[PDB]
Amino acid sequence: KSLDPGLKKGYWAPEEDAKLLQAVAKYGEQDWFKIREEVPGRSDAQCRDRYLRRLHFSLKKGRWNLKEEEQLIELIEKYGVGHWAKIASELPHRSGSQ
DNA sequence: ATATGCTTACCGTAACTTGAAAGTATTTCGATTTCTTGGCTTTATATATCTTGTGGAAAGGACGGTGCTCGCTTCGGC
Numbered sequence: 001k002s003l004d005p006g007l008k009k010g011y012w013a014p015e016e017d018a019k020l021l022q023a024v025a026k027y028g029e030q031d032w033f034k035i036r037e038e039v040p041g042r043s044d045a046q047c048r049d050r051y052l053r054r055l056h057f058s059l060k061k062g063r064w065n066l067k068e069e070e071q072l073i074e075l076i077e078k079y080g081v082g083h084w085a086k087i088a089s090e091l092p093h094r095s096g097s098q
Numbered sequence: 099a100t101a102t103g104c105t106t107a108c109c110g111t112a113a114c115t116t117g118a119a120a121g122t123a124t125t126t127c128g129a130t131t132t133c134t135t136g137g138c139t140t141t142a143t144a145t146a147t148c149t150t151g152t153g154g155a156a157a158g159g160a161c162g163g164t165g166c167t168c169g170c171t172t173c174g175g176c
Contacts, residue, residue, distance in 0.1 A: 002108075
C-alpha cells in the first residue's frame with residue numbers, strides 16, 4: 001500500500017459508491033484480492049476495514065441518553081476491559097479501535 | 099477562533115495458505131549364495147583286439163696388409 005503509482009490517497013469517496021459496493025452483490029467476505037483488480041487507487045487492506053466500518057448495522061450509535069450508561073456497564077462487564085486485552089478477540093465487531 | 103466528533107492511510111505481529119529442495123520407505127533388477135551331480139585321486143587279475151603313436155632302421159636331399167721368390171701355364175722370340 002506504499003510506493004505504488006496506481007494508488008490514490010484521497011479522503012472522500014470518488015466513484016467508491018459504485019466500485020466498492022458492487023462487491024456486496026458480487027463476492028463474499030473472503031478473497032478481497034479479487035476486488036483490487038477492478039477498483040483502481042484502492043488497496044484491499046484498507047478496503048476491508050472501510051467496508052466493515054461503513055456497512056455494519058449493529059453498532060452503539062446515537063445520542064447519549066439516560067439508558068446508555070447501563071449499556072456501557074454491561075458491555076465492560078462481559079469479560080473485562082475489552083479495549084486492548086485479549087478478550088477483544090471474542091467480542092463480535094467490538095474492536096478496540098472504536 | 100479550537101477540541102473532541104467519526105473516518106481511514108498505514109506501519110505494530112501472525113498463520114494458512116503454492117510449490118521446489120531435501121529426507122524416507124518400497125518393490126524391482128541384478129548380483130551373490132547355496133544346493134545338486136560326478137570325476138579327480140588306489141586296486142584288483144581279468145584280456146580283448148584293433149588301432150595309434152611310435153622308432154630304428156632303409157634312404158636320401160640339405161647346406162654345412164706387403165713383398166718375395168721358386169715354379170705353373172700361354173705365346174713367342176729368331
